[PDB]
Design an enzyme around this catalytic site. Structure first.
Site, PDB file in Angstrom:
ATOM      1  N   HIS B  41     -21.438  -6.370  41.524  1.00 22.07           N
ATOM      2  CA  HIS B  41     -20.368  -7.288  41.301  1.00 22.07           C
ATOM      3  C   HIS B  41     -20.175  -7.901  39.924  1.00 22.07           C
ATOM      4  CE1 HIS B  41     -23.325 -10.567  42.320  1.00 22.07           C
ATOM      5  NE2 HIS B  41     -22.975 -11.076  41.208  1.00 22.07           N
ATOM      6  N   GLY B 143     -24.759 -17.736  37.355  1.00 21.76           N
ATOM      7  CA  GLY B 143     -25.551 -16.988  36.576  1.00 21.76           C
ATOM      8  C   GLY B 143     -26.894 -16.280  36.830  1.00 21.76           C
ATOM      9  N   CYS B 145     -27.508 -14.416  39.469  1.00 20.25           N
ATOM     10  CA  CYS B 145     -27.550 -13.158  40.138  1.00 20.25           C
ATOM     11  C   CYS B 145     -28.412 -11.978  39.446  1.00 20.25           C
ATOM     12  CB  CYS B 145     -25.946 -12.617  40.342  1.00 20.25           C
ATOM     13  SG  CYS B 145     -25.179 -13.860  41.292  1.00 20.25           S
TER      14      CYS B 145
HETATM   15  C1  LIG Z   1     -18.752 -16.186  46.809  1.00 17.18           C
HETATM   16  O1  LIG Z   1     -19.492 -15.493  45.486  1.00 17.18           O
HETATM   17  C2  LIG Z   1     -19.701 -14.139  45.440  1.00 17.18           C
HETATM   18  C3  LIG Z   1     -19.645 -13.414  46.723  1.00 17.18           C
HETATM   19  C4  LIG Z   1     -20.051 -12.149  46.809  1.00 17.18           C
HETATM   20  C5  LIG Z   1     -20.823 -11.852  45.757  1.00 17.18           C
HETATM   21  C6  LIG Z   1     -21.096 -12.419  44.623  1.00 17.18           C
HETATM   22  C7  LIG Z   1     -20.671 -13.744  44.426  1.00 17.18           C
HETATM   23  O2  LIG Z   1     -20.689 -14.502  43.568  1.00 17.18           O
HETATM   24  C8  LIG Z   1     -20.968 -13.973  42.253  1.00 17.18           C
HETATM   25  C9  LIG Z   1     -21.464 -15.272  41.196  1.00 17.18           C
HETATM   26  N1  LIG Z   1     -22.425 -16.031  42.002  1.00 17.18           N
HETATM   27  C10 LIG Z   1     -23.167 -16.919  41.388  1.00 17.18           C
HETATM   28  O3  LIG Z   1     -23.170 -16.868  40.126  1.00 17.18           O
HETATM   29  C11 LIG Z   1     -23.946 -17.841  42.211  1.00 17.18           C
HETATM   30  C12 LIG Z   1     -24.945 -17.568  42.917  1.00 17.18           C
HETATM   31  C13 LIG Z   1     -25.804 -18.530  43.682  1.00 17.18           C
HETATM   32  O4  LIG Z   1     -26.575 -17.998  44.343  1.00 17.18           O
HETATM   33  N2  LIG Z   1     -25.396 -19.805  43.393  1.00 17.18           N
HETATM   34  C14 LIG Z   1     -24.418 -20.117  42.545  1.00 17.18           C
HETATM   35  C15 LIG Z   1     -23.980 -21.548  42.814  1.00 17.18           C
HETATM   36  C16 LIG Z   1     -22.929 -22.111  42.023  1.00 17.18           C
HETATM   37  C17 LIG Z   1     -21.784 -21.227  41.613  1.00 17.18           C
HETATM   38  C18 LIG Z   1     -22.271 -19.896  41.429  1.00 17.18           C
HETATM   39  O5  LIG Z   1     -21.388 -18.839  41.035  1.00 17.18           O
HETATM   40  C19 LIG Z   1     -20.097 -19.459  40.294  1.00 17.18           C
HETATM   41  C20 LIG Z   1     -23.634 -19.353  42.087  1.00 17.18           C
END
Ligand SMILES: COc1ccccc1OCCNC(=O)c1cc(=O)[nH]c2cccc(OC)c12
Ligand SMILES: COc1ccccc1OCCNC(=O)c1cc(=O)[nH]c2cccc(OC)c12
Lengths: 304, 304
Positions: B41, B143, B145
């Site tokens: 992703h 960030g 991931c």
């Molecule tokens: C719904 O998002 C996805 C769906 C499928 C695949 C990937 C998706 O996310 C990509 C980005 N995720 C993160 O960086 C993220 C991961 C996490 O565990 N907590 C967060 C807590 C607050 C904000 C966040 O991202 C903005 C995160």
């Protein structure tokens, strides 16, 4: 989201762990620059521990009696000196893995990571707090002495604790890296009992802010209180008195959530008076006091 | 004595963390030999996440679009391929800090350490368990991931998890190092809900053995039970059914304490039926299920 008892990455500290043997006793040492720091009780036999005279015991020891091994390589000891309850073994080689470091003596209520070691090898890492009675609730077995407590500020490791002993109550005592014990404990196998283990109020409140930030809000109420009224309740439950400094330190968490510190104090007051009623907060059934306001901000912001 | 949620030392894993940028998205990568592993992703824009066609999205990407940075040095990407939900970026330099490693897909109930990272830099380490519904209750922000889950066997790091997403419920989903998700989760921003989060019975029992070993015995009773009677109670409280394999795995803890597995099951049965009555076990007010029988033995024996 999510909230875990998180320790600092241990790599920088792993590169400092060595094994120190003196006679039949083997414990851990911390190799920083050309010095290896270890508990002075390395020179004792289990018989000596009842009432050791460390200066007299040290007279019978020479540089060659202290065996220092980093991995599978032996370090040459060219000096030895006692600083309070630690021995400082001068080696002829500076540790090539020495990170930027500081020796800091912490206050009760502050938290740190422990890299538990056996025979100079790291076995695990966990998060701890210096209790108000100057003990730590660690996880240590025989051979763990010399394991260190630390905090990390970007690339600088601040060493704050060195493990020395387990009290008959199963709690742990130790020193800062200058060899001074935290609390009234002495490196002697004697009747030593810890005082009252009070709850770190400022940490519980910080963890209530972490819960709100992470979605757990059931405990938020329609009430407020004052510092004096809150402390009347805190004293009854053996909680540390909350000060204006603590309110100030909780400031950025209050700003982030929009919940005033005294409002959070009234929620904590009701939780103390009525319990959790079978409910949980951040997956815990009790009030967690081993996260400082800095730990909550760090974990909820992503400080690397 | 003492019992802590202990993570493996993270040094060997810290030396593998890199930052991977693709367009405006930056996440973490795992650099092992001449390959960098990261969530696929990375190639998506926040708009794409609603319904991404990764093969079509990958067609528009070339080796030079994937920016890989280890510390302050840029790695040259000479190949890229998609394996399930991970991208494998072939770099021209083998990681000099590559430890002995294995990629293992874990079973629900097993535990592992997580080194949470942001911009390829480690921020913390904690202990987790793969839930029976294939989620993990992690602590992850934007960030994070590409942060990995692992176990350590002396000098061999077995990588078992790579962080991909947070579900709307605040729980975490991810893949093994071959890119296959644990559970039914897909790397799409869609309505995905985890199933029932059942309690890992074999882990709770192992933690009751750790409590007995560490002095907490108040919960030991005069009763016994059978596997079938115990499981009737376990089902009612959404506990995983206990099998003869689980009894066998609890064998060395039973031998160490002298308490038969079915006797410990009857103590657990009474704790489920009557609660803790305001009491604690290993400083916890609930039944802990994130310590396997191997973790208890390891922590209570000193495996480095
Ligand atoms: C719904 O998002 C996805 C769906 C499928 C695949 C990937 C998706 O996310 C990509 C980005 N995720 C993160 O960086 C993220 C991961 C996490 O565990 N907590 C967060 C807590 C607050 C904000 C966040 O991202 C903005 C995160
Ligand atoms: C009463 O002992 C001392 C007194 C003063 C100073 C030092 C003393 O101990 C030196 C050796 N201590 C350890 O290695 C030890 C440390 C620990 O935290 N847990 C243990 C759990 C079981 C068995 C243990 O040792 C045999 C330990």
């Amino acid at each position: 989201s999510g909230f875990r008892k998180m320790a600092f990455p241990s790599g920088k500290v792993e590169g400092c762990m060595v094994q120190v043997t003196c006679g039949t006793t083997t414990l851990n040492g911390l190799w920083l620059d050309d010095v290896v720091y270890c508990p002075r009780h390395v020179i004792c036999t289990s018989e000596d521990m009842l009432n050791p005279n460390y200066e007299d015991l040290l007279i019978r020891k020479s540089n060659h009696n202290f065996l220092v091994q980093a991995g599978n390589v032996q370090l040459r000891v060219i000096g030895h000196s006692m600083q309070n309850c630690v021995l400082k073994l001068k080696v002829d080689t500076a540790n090539p893995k020495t990170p930027k470091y500081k020796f800091v003596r912490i206050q009760p209520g502050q938290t740190f990571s422990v890299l538990a070691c056996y025979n100079g090898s790291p076995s695990g890492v966990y998060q701890c707090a210096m209790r108000p009675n100057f003990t730590i609730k660690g996880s240590f077995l025989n051979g763990s002495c010399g394991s260190v407590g630390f905090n990390i500020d970007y690339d600088c490791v601040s060493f704050c604790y060195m493990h020395h002993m387990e009290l008959p109550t199963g709690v742990h005592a130790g020193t800062d890296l200058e060899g001074n014990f935290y609390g009234p404990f002495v490196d002697r196998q004697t009747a030593q009992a810890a005082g009252t283990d009070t709850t770190i109020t400022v940490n519980v409140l910080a963890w209530l802010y972490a819960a709100v930030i992470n979605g757990d809000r059931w405990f938020l109420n329609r009430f407020t209180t004052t510092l004096n009224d809150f402390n009347l309740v805190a004293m009854k439950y053996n909680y540390e008195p909350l000060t204006q400094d603590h309110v100030d330190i909780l400031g950025p968490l209050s700003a982030q959530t929009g919940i005033a510190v005294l409002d959070m104090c009234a929620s904590l007051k009701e939780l103390l008076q009525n319990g959790m009623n079978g409910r949980t907060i951040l997956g815990s059934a009790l009030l967690e006091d081993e996260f400082t306001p800095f730990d909550v901000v760090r974990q909820c912001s992503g400080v690397t």
